[PDB]
Structure formats: structure tokens, C-alpha cells
């Protein structure tokens with residue numbers, strides 16, 4: 001009776017989102033879908049136990065099976081090293097997976113009509129296309145302990161030349177230094193994914209850089225997008241009455257703030273990280289956002305919950321206190337992954353299921369059933385009473401009941 | 417009868433802002449204040465003629481005289497090189513001045529009660545403390561033409577070692593690479609200015625970094641601020657019922673978006689540039705913002721108009737067409753510079769004048785007299801008629817009339 005779901009790579013995560021991830025599988029996915037599930041535990045304890053090998057194994061499994069669904073994980077700092085008794089301050093697992101797979105992370109707010117926007121003018125959606133490779137996420141940074149020279153060198157593989165640039169001569173005291181890079185092929189794939197997303201939505205595209213300051217580094221992103229546009233997409237954009245334009249990043253954030261939305265925003269890795277959280281919050285709620293890595297092969301995706309592990313709710317949970325955490329982004333990581341799986345397999349039943357679960361999630365919140373964090377968006381936290389929201393278990397039960405109803409009606413809807 | 421103003425370094429700029437700068441001096445400053453004015457023409461034609469030496473000379477004059485007032489300038493790209501027949505694609509003059517002087521650029525919206533905010537919740541101001549030195553603004557960036565290695569090396573001056581790190585081995589094709597740095601003393605000065613700004617306003621302070629990704633580079637900023645706070649400011653913050661907290665940049669931008677304002681935000685150089693424009697736009701208008709570099713000596717400042725040169729209005733001006741450009745940020749660069757000059761010289765007359773001109777500027781707009789760009793914030797550009805605004809000359813005349821009145825009444829309010 002269960003839908004034959006196919007092959008999916010799942011990555012378990014940390015703290016509150018790890019608890020929610022299990023509730024999602026048990027209450028919303030497993031009762032209706034049978035999967036060939038390849039499970040990787042990306043919990044901080046397991047990454048520590050495997051010396052972060054589990055992260056690389058999960059990335060390789062996504063390349064093989066073409067669809068990954070990831071739970072929010074901890075990127076450890078000094079406090080986490082103390083808390084979990086870690087061997088090393090492990091690198092971000094999202095950075096590791098994105099650097100192995102490459103591509104563009106597409107992010108968009110999840111809209112509920114009853115959640116007020118913080119930016120009045122935003123009547124149409126904004127889609128951010130965050131370049132998922134290189135820059136700060138594959139950088140080499142270090143503390144400069146004292147006086148001395150920091151230089152950056154380039155040596156072509158033919159061995160016939162060497163270029164050395166002085167970064168800084170630390171004359172007195174120390175500081176910090178770093179090197180970072182990006183690859184032309186990765187930038188070209190980011191450009192193609194951005195232009196294709198704009199044509200698919202029928203919306204204009206904007207790329208943001210600071211090419212007036214980083215004339216070579218950001219200039220390369222600006223030049224690659226302009227060349228690909230002029231040679232491969234200008235006529236298709238003109239036919240659809242849309243356009244592509246480059247903007248300086250500081251100008252772009254201000255223009256986005258005063259716009260009515262309805263555009264694709266190509267962001268470099270760091271800007272995509274920052275501005276996707278600004279835009280998600282602007283639409284009403286930080287936790288109400290989809291995030292899907294679209295790989296350059298045009299076949300592989302990794303859907304994820306881009307927010308944190310909700311440590312404050314997890315601490316309350318550990319103390320036996322009632323908690324009320326928004327599971328919607330975690331649900332949409334599953335639905336977006338399952339919708340892609342269904343498209344690859346031409347599986348109509350799975351495609352219907354993935355869409356129905358998204359509809360149920362939105363319909364439940366719009367009917368006034370939600371978690372404390374969302375109820376606070378509507379009423380303001382000092383005005384929220386216990387009767388205004390459902391705890392995490394009650395909310396998951398309500399979604400499960402509504403999903404069973406939607407699926408039962410869809411089965412009855414079928415012409416004999 | 418004119419106020420004895422003292423020594424001020426002025427830096428002339430480009431296009432529409434250059435015209436406005438002259439109108440400000442002629443109509444608002446020179447009729448009331450006599451200055452020992454050290455003028456540097458930072459117009460693109462003069463920077464080209466002097467091989468950018470005028471920019472360095474202006475920075476040295478600010479170190480000497482302690483107060484600079486700067487007009488908006490062009491940072492040239494490929495199109496500007498063609499337009500002005502430039503010898504070189506000159507570096508940002510703001511970057512050059514800030515790197516020579518060092519310090520923190522404090523940015524805050526200029527509030528007019530009749531200009532609608534785009535972010536409803538912002539009932540109190542937000543002050544951004546942008547670290548003015550290093551990072552992207554003093555980086556070495558370059559195109560990687562093909563396969564080869566990019567490495568970053570540290571050679572201690574005490575010659576005890578040499579550390580070489582691989583940034584990237586380009587195996588196929590090329591891309592881009594860059595080295596950047598920061599200095600411990602500059603970060604320490606940025607921390608002191610941020611804590612002192614917070615204690616001065618009686619508001620909490622937040623520092624944003626991405627230390628989970630750049631563990632050493634951003635970790636150093638986080639550690640320096642924490643050590644300075646724990647040892648020198650914590651008890652003072654507790655006494656004023658305020659606090660200091662570090663936030664990850666993506667979390668911070670979302671937190672800022674949903675807050676009610678009323679905090680100091682310590683931003684690294686790049687974040688300060690991006691977020692200052694996002695925040696200025698959020699308050700209602702990009703062009704309504706003050707920007708004052710506060711140098712580490714605690715005596716030197718450089719006030720500036722942080723927005724663009726308004727090329728579109730300049731093109732209309734060149735064609736003999738009527739224009740209506742907001743001169744307020746350019747006016748506040750003068751009033752903030754003159755107010756600092758007055759504080760250094762204990763000149764009550766100049767301090768009174770600088771404050772009166774700021775009051776006149778706000779009172780004029782709040783009374784419904786403004787330029788087309790501000791009238792469009794209230795009505796929407798398609799609804800703006802000629803009767804809704806004053807052209808640039810009419811607006812400057814209105815301000816001049818209101819300033820003459822305010823000053824005349826202040827003189828009459830005096831007791832024998």
C-alpha cells in the first residue's frame with residue numbers, strides 16, 4: 001500500500017532538529033512511502049568518531065543516488081569542542097558536502113498568508129541562487145603570531161614562471177591572514193544555473209559582486225555571467241520580457257529591500273549565506289525557508305534545513321520542559337528531495353505525495369495551528385498564551401492527522 | 417560677524433554630488449563660517465592627473481588637521497576608464513583614506529518622521545560600527561590563468577621558521593585567488609570604539625563574524641572583543657543594564673531585521689559596507705545616512721557622504737534638464753565634521769551652528785519640502801507630480817532661508 005519511493009540518501013543531524021527529523025520520518029514519511037534509504041549519521045558525536053569520514057561518505061552516496069535530504073548539523077567552535085570533548089574543531093559538514101558536489105543552493109521563503117511580512121513591499125517571492133563552492137568555505141586562514149611577511153604565490157604547472165604578491169608585512173605585532181579561491185568552471189555552472197532558474201520562473205536576474213574593490217576576483221564573476229548571457233541567453237530573456245543585470249552588493253541589498261520582489265538573485269557563497277537569512281526573516285520567519293543544492297550534472301540535488309539546531313529548545317527538552325519548535329523547513333527538505341526523486345523516476349504517486357505534504361503543512365498553519373515561535377510572529381511573544389500554540393508532538397500529530405485526511409481524499413478522488 | 421571655524425580638510429568629489437557640495441559651501445557654510453580650509457580635489461580627473469597622489473595627500477592632511485569632510489567619489493571600473501580616458505583603474509579613494517587613517521566608520525540613518533520605514537519594527541536607531549581597515553579593502557586578488565598552485569606563506573621576521581599552505585592546486589583550467597589580512601592592533605581599536613559607542617548610547621553591542629567557517633581569521637575578532645569586554649568593559653555594561661554578545665553574521669542580519677532597533681552593531685569591513693546600505697534603506701531612504709570615520713587616536717575624524725555620485729541626475733544636469741537630488745547626507749558630512757572641529761576647539765558658536773543646520777534640514781523635510789527622490793519614498797514615483805517637490809536649487813534656497821531664520825532667532829534669544 002506504501003508508495004515505492006526509490007533511493008534517497010538521508011543525513012541525520014544534531015540537537016532539537018535531530019529529534020524533529022525522527023518525528024518527521026515516523027509520523028509523515030514512513031507510514032506512506034517505502035524507501036531504499038541510505039542513512040548517514042552526521043550527528044557531531046558520529047563525525048568525531050569517524051574523524052569526519054561519514055560526511056565525505058554521505059557526499060559520495062549523493063553523487064551515486066542523486067538525491068540527499070539533510071538535517072541541520074552543528075559546525076563546532078571552541079565551546080562545542082569543550083561540550084562534546086571533540087578531537088578536532090571539525091569543518092562545516094555543509095561546506096564539505098557542497099564543495100564535493102558543487103552547484104548552486106536555491107533558497108526561497110515558505111509563505112503562510114497569516115504570517116506577517118516584516119518588509120511590506122515584498123508581494124512577489126525572491127529566489128536566491130547561492131554559489132555553493134569555494135570562497136570563504138574552502139579558504140586557508142591562520143593567525144599571524146608576530147612580525148613577518150605574508151605572501152601569496154602562483155606557480156603555473158609548466159614550471160616556467162612564479163608570481164609572488166605581498167599580502168602584508170607585519171612590522172609590529174601580529175594579526176590574521178587568509179587565502180581563498182574560486183574556479184572558472186564552477187562560476188560558469190553557477191551562471192548557467194542562475195540564467196536557467198530566471199527563464200523557468202519568468203523573472204529578471206541580478207548578480208551581486210563588489211568588482212570595484214576586488215577588480216580581479218569579483219570582476220571574473222561579473223565577466224563570466226555577462227559573456228554567458230550575451231552568447232547563450234540574451235534572446236531567450238528578451239523573448240520572455242526579462243533581463244539580467246549586475247549590481248554592486250551594497251546597492252543590491254538596498255534595491256532588494258525597496259523592491260516588490262519577483263526576481264532571481266545570484267549571490268556569491270558568502271553573500272548567499274547572509275542575504276538568504278535576511279530575506280527569509282523579511283518574509284516573516286527565519287525558519288520558513290527551502291534550501292536545495294542543484295548540482296552541475298542537472299540530475300543531483302541535496303535538500304536541507306538551512307537554519308540552526310535550535311540549541312535553546314534542546315536545552316529546555318533536556319530539562320524535561322515542554323518545547324514548541326517549527327519543523328516546517330525540516331519537512332520541506334524531505335518534500336523537495338522526494339519531489340526531485342519523483343521527477344528522476346517519473347513517479348507520479350511520489351510527486352503527488354511530496355506536493356500534498358507541502359500543502360498540508362501550509363494549510364495547517366493558515367488554519368491557526370502552529371508552534372510557539374510562529375505564534376509569536378503573529379501576536380508578539382509577550383501576548384502568546386499556551387492556548388495559542390501546539391507543542392512539537394501536538395503539532396506533528398496535527399500535521400499527521402491532516403496528511404492522512406488529504407491522502408485518503410486524493411485516493412477517493414481517483415476515477416475508477 | 418562670521419564664526420571662526422578653524423582648520424578643516426575638504427575633499428571635492430564627482431558628478432552630481434560635486435555640484436551639490438559647491439551649493440552647500442556657498443549657501444549654507446561660507447555665509448556663516450570662516451574656515452582655514454585645506455581643499456583637495458578628489459574628482460576622478462584630478463586623481464588621474466596626480467596618479468592618485470591627491471588622495472594620499474588628503475589622508476595625510478586629515479592626520480595633521482584632525483577633521484576631514486568628504487564628497488562622494490567615483491571608484492572606476494572598465495566603463496569609467498573608457499569614459500574618462502584614465503591611465504589606470506584607480507583604487508577606491510575611500511579605501512585608501514580609511515587604510516591610512518584606520519579606525520571605525522560609524523553609520524546611522526538620518527530620521528525624518530514623515531519618511532515611511534520599510535521595516536515596521538525599527539522604532540529605535542541602529543548604529544553600525546564598520547571596521548575601516550583591511551580585509552577585502554586591502555586585499556591582493558588576481559586571475560589564475562591556468563593550471564598551477566596557489567600558496568600562502570608566512571615568513572617570521574625573527575626567521576625562526578617559514579610556513580607554506582596550499583590555497584588550491586588548479587588541476588584543469590583557471591579561476592581567481594586572493595590573499596587578505598587584518599592586524600591585531602586595528603581589531604583592538606575597533607573593539608574599544610564599539611564598546612565605548614555602546615556605553616555612550618546606553619545600548620547593547622553585537623559583533624557579527626562567521627567564526628564557525630573562518631575559525632582562525634574571524635575567531636581572532638571574536639577572541640579580541642571577548643578578552644577586551646571581560647577585562648575592561650563587562651562591569652560597566654552590567655551597571656548600565658546593557659550587554660555585549662557575538663553573533664554569526666547570517667543569524668545577526670535576521671535578528672536585526674526582526675528587532676526594534678536600539679543597538680550598536682560592530683561589523684567587519686565588508687559586512688559594514690553591505691549591511692549599512694541595507695539598514696539605511698530599511699529606515700526609509702538609502703541617501704539618509706551619516707558616516708563618520710573615528711580614528712584610533714580619539715582625536716581625528718573623517719565625515720563623508722557614503723552614497724553614490726547620482727550619475728543619472730548628473731546626465732540630466734549635463735543636458736540642461738531640471739534635477740531634484742537629496743543633499744542631506746552631503747550636508748551632514750559638513751555638520752558632523754564641523755561639530756567634531758567645535759569639540760576639539762571648545763568652540764560653542766561652531767557647535768551651535770552645526771546642530772542648527774542639522775535641525776533646519778530635518779525640520780524642512782518634516783514640513784513637507786523635499787526633493788523628488790524623497791517625495792517618491794512617500795507617494796511612490798508614478799504618483800509624484802512637480803508640485804510635490806523642489807528642484808535642487810529651490811531646496812538649497814529653502815534650507816538657506818530656514819537656516820538664516822533659525823540663526824537670526826537664536827541671536828534674538830540672547831540676553832545682554
Ligand SMILES: *[C@H]1[C@@H](C#N)C(=O)[C@@H](C)[C@@H]2CCc3cnc(Nc4ccccc4)nc3[C@@]12c1cccc(C(=O)O)c1
Nearest residue numbers: 286287307310312313322323324325326372373376381
Ligand atoms: C522556542 C520556545 C519554545 N518552546 C521558547 O520558549 C523560547 C525560549 C525559544 C527561544 C529561542 C528559540 C529559537 N528558535 C526557535 N525556533 C526556531 C525553529 C526553527 C528554526 C529557527 C528557529 N524558537 C525559540 C523559542 C522561541 C519561542 C517563541 C518566540 C521566539 C522568538 O525569539 O521570537 C523564540
Ligand SMILES: *[C@H]1[C@@H](C#N)C(=O)[C@@H](C)[C@@H]2CCc3cnc(Nc4ccccc4)nc3[C@@]12c1cccc(C(=O)O)c1
Nearest residue numbers: 702703723726728729738739740741742788789792797
Ligand atoms: C532623480 C530624479 C530627478 N530629478 C529622476 O527624475 C529619476 C529619473 C532619478 C533616477 C535615478 C536617481 C538616483 N538617485 C537619486 N537620488 C539620490 C540622492 C542621494 C543619494 C542617493 C540617491 N535620484 C534618482 C532619481 C529618482 C527620483 C525619484 C525616485 C527615484 C527612485 O529610484 O526611487 C529616483
Ligand SMILES: [Ca+2]
Nearest residue numbers: 273277306666
Ligand atoms: Ca546560513
Ligand SMILES: [Ca+2]
Nearest residue numbers: 250689690693
Ligand atoms: Ca557602500
